């Protein structure tokens with residue numbers, strides 16, 4: 001019976017969809033995702049900002065964005081080394097924007113930064129003690145992605 | 150056509166189901182699951198027992214339960230801090246029961262425990278050295294979930 | 299309906315395939331896979347060689363094999379303790395081959411190794427210093443699987 005088989009296929013597909021979602025939930029949890037909080041993941045590879053951005057988008061996430069101290073601390077702990085943040089002033093020098101949109105609100109700049117040093121620095125890294133510093137987007141820094149809460 | 154197209158699709162689904170199962174095995178392995186041993190995992194978040202029960206059930210798992218010394222050690226090494234166990238005497242004071250049913254078969258109580266201290270303590274936490282202490286279910290401890298061997 | 303439901307199911311299956319691919323990409327990333335580089339994974343379990351082979355095959359991978367100084371270091375870092383390599387001279391004493399097939403293209407043998415000591419040693423482990431040493435395949439060493447770049 002073709003219709004009986006089609007209904008089974010629907011049931012099979014639905015079952016699969018539910019299991020894949022459970023697998024994603026389990027993975028996030030094992031990656032340290034706290035309930036109702038976005039989580040961060042890194043492979044500890046250093047690369048230019050454009051590569052991090054491409055990579056994270058490929059994973060349906062975005063370059064990590066600290067929107068408060070807790071998140072800043074979380075990113076610092078995941079990264080373990082200097083890493084790019086999803087913040088840049090490439091569009092208009094001096095005005096930092098999130099890669100996903102909007103002007104920067106919470107910030108944790110290191111003393112005397114951002115300084116757009118020399119020829120210029122339009123990207124941002126989370127460095128020592130979790131403070132931030134603007135740097136050339138061409139530099140290679142750890143890739144840390146954030147995924148929705 | 151229809152029947153052939155349908156049969157081909159059923160084959161595709163079966164293949165996808167196998168792939169997901171492989172994804173699950175590899176995830177558990179990368180997370181430290183030992184062959185033939187239960188898989189214990191945590192996000193390192195502390196929360197009330199009710200929250201833990203909810204979280205693990207949502208992942209289609211259960212609150213970690215040590216049935217022997219080997220499992221107690223395994224849970225201890227996953228939690229790294231104090232964590233709730235799936236054991237309570239909430240229903241009947243003095244008689245600890247697994248959240249999945251049954252009376253205790255193995256216990257590892259710390260000296261002077263269980264004491265049902267003060268207003269009463271119905272939940273169990275695996276603390277330092279792997280020893281157990283009964284505490285208020287409302288207190289916040291690490292969430293450790295258990296998955297099949 | 300029939301044809302419409304069937305065509306939709308096809309799109310549903312195709313959507314699921316993409317999602318699972320994404321899940322696999324994200325999991326590899328979480329496991330530390332570097333772009334275009336092969337990656338090694340371990341659950342840190344010690345078992346005999348036959349078991350390692352069986353387990354990695356079950357994960358659709360192969361027992362870790364260092365093709366150069368770089369990979370040799372990479373494996374050593376993942377394992378943390380002496381692990382088996384996908385190299386043995388089981389077939390013909392003295393002729394070490396990859397479990398995947400072929401003669402050695404690279405090797406980092408310690409002085410006077412391999413020596414087929416005593417009752418015999420047909421397996422190889424990466425010691426806690428990069429060097430190789432042939433050991434008994436019955437010994438329990440850390441299981442490290444390798445997946446392609």
Ligand SMILES: CO[C@@H]1O[C@H](CO)[C@@H](O[C@@H]2O[C@H](CO)[C@H](O)[C@H](OS(=O)(=O)O)[C@H]2O)[C@H](O[C@@H]2O[C@@H](C)[C@@H](O)[C@@H](O)[C@@H]2O)[C@H]1NC(C)=O
Nearest residue numbers: 110111112113114115116117118119120121133134135136
């Ligand atoms: C007096 O201000 C500081 O001057 C030094 C020297 O010019 C700055 O450091 C240089 O910054 C360059 C930025 O592209 C580059 O990294 C230089 O390295 S190298 O010589 O090309 O190898 C580096 O010496 C310094 O900038 C800060 O520190 C840098 C290391 C870099 O992280 C910048 O983003 C920082 O802003 C200046 N510091 C301040 C506080 O103005």
Ligand SMILES: CC(=O)N[C@@H]1[C@@H](O[C@@H]2O[C@@H](C)[C@@H](O)[C@@H](O)[C@@H]2O)[C@H](O[C@@H]2O[C@H](CO)[C@H](O)[C@H](OS(=O)(=O)O)[C@H]2O)[C@@H](CO)O[C@H]1O
Nearest residue numbers: 408409410411412413414415416417418419431432433434
């Ligand atoms: C170069 C050589 O001949 N070395 C001998 C040495 O074997 C090496 O070291 C072992 C520990 C082992 O890793 C071997 O694979 C190395 O080639 C001998 O050591 C003994 O080796 C046996 C066989 O594995 C065994 O491990 C012994 O330990 S046991 O007693 O616990 O079983 C180990 O001592 C050494 C012994 O005389 O002779 C060296 O010439």
Ligand SMILES: [Ca+2]
Nearest residue numbers: 089093120122
């Ligand atoms: Ca600029």
Ligand SMILES: [Ca+2]
Nearest residue numbers: 089116121122
């Ligand atoms: Ca700038």
Ligand SMILES: [Ca+2]
Nearest residue numbers: 115117133134
């Ligand atoms: Ca700067």
Ligand SMILES: [Ca+2]
Nearest residue numbers: 019169170173
């Ligand atoms: Ca399953």
Ligand SMILES: [Ca+2]
Nearest residue numbers: 238242269271
């Ligand atoms: Ca009680």
Ligand SMILES: [Ca+2]
Nearest residue numbers: 238265270271
């Ligand atoms: Ca009690």
Ligand SMILES: [Ca+2]
Nearest residue numbers: 264265266283
């Ligand atoms: Ca107590």
Ligand SMILES: [Ca+2]
Nearest residue numbers: 387391418420
């Ligand atoms: Ca031999």
Ligand SMILES: [Ca+2]
Nearest residue numbers: 387414419420
């Ligand atoms: Ca040999």
Ligand SMILES: [Ca+2]
Nearest residue numbers: 413415431432
């Ligand atoms: Ca030897």
Ligand SMILES: [Cl-]
Nearest residue numbers: 121122136137
């Ligand atoms: Cl720049």
Ligand SMILES: [Cl-]
Nearest residue numbers: 270271285286
């Ligand atoms: Cl209580």
Ligand SMILES: [Cl-]
Nearest residue numbers: 419420434435
């Ligand atoms: Cl052997």
